[PDB]
Amino acid sequence: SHMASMKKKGSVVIVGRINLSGDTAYAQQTRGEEGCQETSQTGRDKNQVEGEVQIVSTATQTFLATSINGVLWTVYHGAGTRTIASPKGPVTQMYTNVDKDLVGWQAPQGSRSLTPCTCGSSDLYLVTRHADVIPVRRRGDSRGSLLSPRPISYLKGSSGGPLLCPAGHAVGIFRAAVSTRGVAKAVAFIPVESLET
Numbered sequence: 001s002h003m004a005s006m007k008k009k010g011s012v013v014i015v016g017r018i019n020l021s022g023d024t025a026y027a028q029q030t031r032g033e034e035g036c037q038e039t040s041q042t043g044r045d046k047n048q049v050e051g052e053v054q055i056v057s058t059a060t061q062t063f064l065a066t067s068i069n070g071v072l073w074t075v076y077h078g079a080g081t082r083t084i085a086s087p088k089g090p091v092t093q094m095y096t097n098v099d100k101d102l103v104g105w106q107a108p109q110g111s112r113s114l115t116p117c118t119c120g121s122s123d124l125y126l127v128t129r130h131a132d133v134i135p136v137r138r139r140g141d142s143r144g145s146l147l148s149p150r151p152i153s154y155l156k157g158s159s160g161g162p163l164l165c166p167a168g169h170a171v172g173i174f175r176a177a178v179s180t181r182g183v184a185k186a187v188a189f190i191p192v193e194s195l196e197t
């Protein structure tokens with residue numbers, strides 16, 4: 001039967017984290033490929049969640065998610081409308097705004113949120129899925145220029161990750177990147193002013 005064969009789309013799965021609790025940033029994997037695919041279909045994730053920045057994956061893409069104001073935020077172009085796997089089953093999004101490329105689930109038990117920056121700083125720091133901390137000069141409300149342009153491959157898969165001020169508050173989450181001949185020159189981010197329900 002056609003309708004009996006209609007499958008359901010998988011959940012987003014936390015597969016790691018970017019640890020920013022010490023003086024080095026470093027990436028941690030908490031789930032391998034097979035475990036990720038299984039957890040995506042069931043939506044049941046019993047792993048203990050920690051930290052502010054999570055590495056997340058669907059069946060087909062991997063990116064980042066950042067907890068701010070008690071909500072785990074990420075980009076719509078990565079997560080779509082998908083639920084997220086949790087200890088008590090799949091969890092539906094708290095917030096969905098395709099016009100901001102922004103979605104949110106209630107933050108996991110055991111996670112912590114970053115503080116929204118109120119500094120009005122223009123010296124920003126983008127955290128990548130590889131735990132690189134990339135200086136960025138803020139341009140206006142939602143853009144920034146890389147101080148040292150790198151290859152665009154260095155940024156791929158880091159959408160949903162945080163841009164932080166010098167003191168470590170959250171200024172926004174990484175949304176898109178602008179390149180010129182394959183070198184990343186600037187980024188766009190969702191201002192933290194929007195990461196609140």
Ligand SMILES: COc1ccc2nc(C)c(O[C@@H]3C[C@H]4C(=O)N[C@]5(C(=O)NS(=O)(=O)C6(C)CC6)C[C@H]5/C=C\CCCCC[C@H](NC(=O)OCC5(C)CC5)C(=O)N4C3)nc2c1
Nearest residue numbers: 061062063077078098101155156157158159175176177188
């Ligand atoms: C379908 O429903 C929606 C709704 C709203 C929405 N809004 C977007 C802005 C958007 O854009 C697409 C995804 C995005 C990223 O790639 N985002 C990351 C990233 O890494 N994603 S990812 O790898 O994690 C992934 C795909 C999740 C798994 C962070 C960059 C890093 C490298 C970019 C690679 C080349 C791409 C250059 C491109 N540039 C740009 O569009 O600039 C525009 C501007 C600012 C005006 C000039 C770009 O950034 N994107 C393409 N799709 C949508 C889709």
Ligand SMILES: [Zn+2]
Nearest residue numbers: 117119165169
């Ligand atoms: Zn600040």
